[PDB]
């Protein structure tokens, strides 16, 4: 529920800094209150008495100076500390966030959370915290100290201040609401244009760009919305606090002049009281000025809080030692649909993969075949089933011992910025050169490591040397082949261009002198040729099981798929 819980405890600089800030506010308060008697000597019959109070005010202001200096230093230190803590927290928290929370724009929000908060969080305490809170409390203490000298005046400000606070609050709220209304209307307007620009290639080719243009043009030009209630809800956002302050000015000046006209106080110092009221009305103007910085800080802190409030996954008290030998798997109607509506769903898959074989999951398009691998690994959670690898349950197991059984090859490869040797070593920080050599030789990548300018040290990152498809996929295959985890679940990368990649996959699958349970979501018949037991999957539920040859006798939905793959591999493009 933490919105911006930055500090651990530390208690000490916290309490000290709060007390110092309060004393620094009291400094300016007593400065003005000590200005109070000064004017009574100028507009009077004795203009020489002023020197004493001038000296006292000098003492007050040097005290104020020292206080503000020390509070500014403590503020910059606290800014450093808060930056460090919050960014380390967000970084260490990102991995445990629920996986399906990353949409196309939620990802952009998260990306902004840790790319645009450097300079706007270090200079936060010394720019928003201290000034705003030092300017809010000051009027109250000024009125309080004014009370014992002129109680007729004091109570007036003591009752006025909440009205001005409420006016500031209401003005800010009105401005915010107006801005949201405006930008929402603008987006709703330009949506049509945003759409018309993406289909600019299907329209012109369909020789129908002129009517398709005229339609949206007519619509956009016609619609107006008249903007009038928008202006009427905008105006008060601008002119409310100016009016409040202008009215308070007349009120206070009038009450002072009225008290003068009766003879309670005297003329020589009524002017001092007026000056003090004018001094008292300034922090409100300062707070009114510190609006836009406040709004931008609200926006960025909202990004950070939204990141810090995402749902999480749960794992507890796992028991592993090895897998013993090699785990067998199991499903029970896992039913994973992401909402019950639009999604893989998987309405009724239930099988059992014996302890260590090759097994391909063929089937028509519709990525149940990939969510099955996700569920097997650990990334997703079956909403109502129980994956029971070997005899336990993965969902009721510890996180540290959860990402320690599977080793995954991914359909879409991913290499982080660094030397490819580091990428391949990103699976085992140990792995002496025997392991690394056998891995780099099994996946056909020794060729790439030998025809490299400097050798094994190229910085791939983004925009690699060539490293298009086949190369990155072979690096990923080698990396996933390094890890010792005794179940290898392969995902057939969509690249039917590289005979080297094909042979690399076949080799990694069938030639490893180790012994692991293998699963390969494959479509290249060369791959599913070795799998001694295939699982056909349409609309969730498994539709067919059995060895290869046996399914080619049944003659159901697999003979058709085999005869369709044996034909869509020699399709010539002659024309007759």
């Amino acid at each position: 529920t933490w919105i911006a819980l930055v500090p651990n405890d530390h208690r000490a600089r916290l309490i000290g800094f709060a007390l110092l800030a309060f004393c620094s506010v009291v400094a300016r308060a007593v400065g003005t209150v000590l200005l109070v008697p000064l004017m009574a000597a100028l507009f009077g019959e004795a203009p020489q008495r002023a020197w004493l109070w001038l000296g006292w005010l000098s003492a007050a202001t040097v005290a104020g100076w020292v206080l503000d200096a020390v509070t500014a230093r403590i503020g910059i230190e606290l800014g450093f500390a808060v930056l460090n803590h919050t960014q380390h927290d967000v970084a260490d928290r990102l991995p445990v966030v629920r996986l399906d929370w990353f949409t196309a724009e939620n990802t952009a929000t998260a990306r902004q959370a840790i790319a645009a908060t450097g300079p706007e969080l270090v200079g936060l305490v010394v720019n928003l915290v201290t000034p705003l809170t030092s300017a809010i409390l000051l009027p109250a203490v000024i009125a309080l100290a004014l009370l014992p000298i002129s109680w007729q005046l004091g109570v007036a400000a003591l009752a006025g201040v909440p009205l001005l606070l409420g006016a500031l609050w209401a003005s800010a709220a009105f401005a915010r609401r107006a801005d949201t209304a405006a930008d929402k209307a603008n987006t709703a307007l330009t949506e049509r244009i945003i759409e018309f620009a993406r289909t600019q290639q299907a329209l012109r080719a369909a020789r129908r760009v002129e009517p398709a243009r005229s339609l949206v043009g007519n619509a956009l030009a016609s619609q107006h919305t008249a903007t009038m209630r928008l202006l009427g809800m905008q105006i008060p956002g601008q002119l409310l606090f100016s009016i409040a302050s202008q009215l308070a000015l007349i009120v206070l000046a009038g009450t002072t002049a009225a008290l003068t006209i009766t003879g309670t106080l005297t003329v020589p110092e009524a002017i001092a009281l007026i000056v003090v009221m004018v001094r008292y009305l300034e922090p409100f103007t300062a707070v009114s000025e510190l609006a836009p910085a406040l709004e931008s800080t609200r926006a960025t802190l909202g990004r950070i809080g939204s990141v810090l409030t995402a749902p999480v996954m749960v794992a507890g008290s796992g028991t592993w030692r090895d897998g013993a030998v090699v785990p067998r798997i199991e499903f029970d109607d896992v039913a994973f649909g992401y909402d019950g509506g639009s999604g893989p769903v998987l309405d009724g898959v239930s099988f059992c993969l014996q302890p260590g074989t090759t097994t391909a999951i063929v089937g028509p398009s519709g990525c149940g075949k990939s969510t099955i691998l996700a569920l097997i690994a650990g990334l997703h959670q079956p909403t109502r089933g129980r994956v029971l690898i070997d005899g336990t349950d993965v969902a009721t197991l510890d996180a540290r011992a959860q990402q320690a059984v599977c080793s995954v090859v991914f359909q879409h490869p991913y290499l982080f910025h660094g030397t490819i040797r580091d990428n391949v070593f990103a699976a085992d920080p140990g792995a002496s050169d025997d392991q690394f050599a056998q891995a780099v030789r099994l996946a056909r990548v020794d060729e790439l490591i030998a025809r490299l300018p400097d050798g094994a040290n190229t910085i791939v990152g983004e925009a690699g040397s060539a490293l298009s498809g086949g190369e990155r996929q072979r690096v990923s295959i080698a990396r996933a082949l390094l890890k010792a985890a005794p179940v290898l679940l392969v995902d057939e990368a969509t690249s039917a261009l590289d005979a080297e990649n094909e042979a690399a996959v076949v080799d990694a699958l069938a030639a490893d002198p180790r012994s692991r349970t293998r699963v390969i979501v494959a479509h290249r018949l060369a791959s599913i040729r070795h799998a001694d037991r295939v699982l056909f999957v349409d609309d969730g539920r498994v539709v067919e099981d059995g060895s290869i040859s046996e399914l080619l006798t049944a003659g159901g939905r697999f003979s058709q798929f085999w005869r369709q793959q044996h034909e869509a591999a020699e399709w010539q493009i002659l024309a007759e």
Partner: protein, 571 residues
């Protein structure tokens, strides 16, 4: 910098209303800050006999001032919000009418995020600049000038004395802005590279969950980042502290107090003439600094307008040039060609002097080592770009002398994009001919092998093709191919890299293409040799300079680059 660099060029109409709103903002600001002068007058009034009615006249003037100030502010904001909408509407209309003249290659260049960014962000930023940034800036500019003049006309001593803290602030700022010389651009570079690394880290999430040893890179990058900022800001601490201290309304108060006490105690001036400085003139310091922020508020809108005008000043397609009589020796088919040398982004030419000819009803294969300007040569034929030297002619008429309808009635392309429009499926199958009598649609869909997948839909032929329609690649590539079979354009551009997407659902796409290319001139952009090795003729090329052309066996046994390309060990 100055009067005209594309920005005032965009902002041509908004000059007269802008200066009107400016003078009105100055006036309303003076109306905002006159109450203090009124207070000074009442203060003087208090020390010579008050009476009943004189102070009441003063107060009546004050309340009238309040009322008229509020009225003026309301009038100003209404006039601004009025003058903004017409300009926004004209801008959007002109932007659309320009958008429907750009060459197709521009869109593929930009992408998807660029368009939305440009349109939405720039229009909204321009609106904000017009409605907020200008009045606040002119007000923050006019206020200090006014208060300074008023402080000088009442006394030249105290204002000259008060000028000091401004000097102190300026010298401290100028001394500060010598230590962060390159540090600013270095930190900007750090910021952009950290943005890049953040994007990378986020997009590669699943791997991180399995191999938990791949987060060390990002971790150490973040550590070095925060260390850099910490080591950067540590020195400037005391300097910024002094910069702040010598502005605050505390020091101004003591300075004014000392100067006034020295002046009055020696009878050099009357005491009532010290009221203006006790009033406005103690916040003068913090008020001056607002000028920098008010002026800096314009940067965003200025950059937005610059970018938008640079975009809008793009060049459209060529002129429908001199119509000359066609048919020196050619036919409806037979798309000749000649020394093209397209180039694009000049310095580097991507193509070179090619001269080939597609026969009336035969296929042609544009084989070549990928990346060596192989697809661009085809896209250029569909007027994605204009040639800089040479002339294409579908038949005899150069594509320049052909309207945007006579062109796309003789050239139909199929590329690596889907481009589905928001409507009923029957319309997307019948976009070519807008009124097919609901049976030609069905036969042209039962010839593209998309009949079953459209029949077993939520609502069949009438389910709106939304972003979440529940479709895929080869499931809608067949939809666009069904749309293309209705066109019947006797020239086809066939990007072959669409037959092996989602390699599961590609047998149907192959059947669709088979019954789509029936006796019409094709031009296949080959990606595999065995599929194309029997078309009619094979053209090899490496960044222009067509290496050799002819038939399969001819290319095969000549020692050719074809022979060095089809020997990847037969694979």
């Amino acid at each position: 910098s100055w009067r005209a660099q594309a920005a005032s060029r965009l902002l041509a109409p908004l000059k007269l209303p802008l200066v009107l709103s400016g003078v009105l903002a100055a006036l309303v600001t003076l109306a905002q800050l006159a109450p203090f002068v009124l207070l000074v007058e009442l203060s003087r009034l208090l020390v010579s006999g008050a009476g009943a009615h004189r102070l009441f006249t003063v107060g009546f003037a004050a309340v009238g001032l309040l009322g008229t100030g509020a009225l003026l502010a309301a009038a100003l904001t209404l006039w601004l919000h009025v003058i903004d909408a017409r300009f926004a509407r004209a801008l959007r209309l002109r932007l659309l009418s320009k958008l429907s003249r750009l060459p197709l290659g521009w869109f593929t260049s930009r992408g998807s995020g660029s368009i939305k960014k440009l349109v939405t962000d720039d229009t909204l930023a321009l609106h904000y600049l017009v409605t907020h940034a200008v009045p606040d800036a002119v007000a923050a500019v006019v206020a200090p000038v006014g208060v300074l003049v008023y402080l000088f006309v009442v006394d030249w001593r105290v204002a000259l004395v008060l000028f000091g803290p401004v000097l102190v602030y300026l010298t401290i700022t100028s001394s500060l802005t010598i230590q962060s010389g390159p540090r600013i651009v270095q930190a900007q570079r750090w910021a952009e590279k950290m943005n890049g690394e953040a994007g990378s880290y986020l997009e590669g999430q699943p791997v991180i969950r399995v191999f938990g040893a791949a987060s060390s890179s990002f971790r150490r990058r973040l550590d070095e980042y925060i260390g850099f900022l910490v080591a950067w800001q540590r020195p400037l601490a005391g300097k910024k502290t002094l910069m702040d201290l010598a502005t605050r309304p505390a020091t101004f108060l003591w300075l004014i107090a000392a100067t006034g006490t020295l002046l009055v105690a020696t009878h050099r001036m009357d005491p009532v003439n010290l009221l203006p400085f006790m009033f406005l003139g103690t916040t003068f310091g913090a008020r001056l600094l607002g000028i920098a922020y008010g002026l800096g508020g314009l940067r965003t809108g200025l950059l937005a307008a610059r970018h938008l005008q640079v975009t809008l000043d793009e060049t459209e397609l060529a002129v429908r040039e001199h119509p000359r009589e066609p048919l020196d020796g050619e036919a409806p088919a037979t798309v000749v060609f000649d020394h093209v040398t397209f180039g694009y982004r000049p310095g580097v030419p991507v193509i070179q002097d090619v001269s080939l000819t597609l026969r009336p009803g035969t296929v042609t294969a544009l084989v070549g080592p990928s990346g060596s300007g192989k697809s661009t040569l085809a896209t250029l034929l569909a007027r994605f770009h204009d040639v800089e030297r040479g002339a294409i002619r579908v038949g005899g008429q150069d594509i320049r002398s052909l309207a945007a309808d006579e062109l796309y009635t003789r050239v139909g392309f199929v590329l690596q994009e889907a481009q589905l429009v928001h409507g009923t499926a029957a319309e997307n199958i019948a976009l070519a001919v807008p009124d097919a009598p609901a049976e030609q649609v069905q036969v042209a869909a039962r010839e593209a092998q998309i009949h079953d997948r459209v029949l077993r839909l939520p609502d069949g032929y009438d389910t709106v093709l939304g972003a979440n329609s529940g479709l895929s690649g080869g499931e809608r590539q067949r939809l666009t191919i069904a749309r293309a079979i209705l066109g019947d354009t006797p020239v086809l551009i066939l990007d072959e890299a669409t037959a092996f997407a989602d390699p599961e659902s590609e047998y149907l796409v192959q059947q669709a293409l088979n019954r789509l290319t029936r006796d019409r001139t094709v031009l296949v952009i080959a990606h595999r040799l065995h599929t194309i090795t029997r078309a009619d003729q094979i053209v090899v090329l490496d960044h222009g300079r067509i290496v050799e052309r002819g038939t399969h066996e001819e290319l095969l046994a000549a020692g050719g680059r074809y022979c060095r390309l089809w020997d990847t060990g037969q694979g």
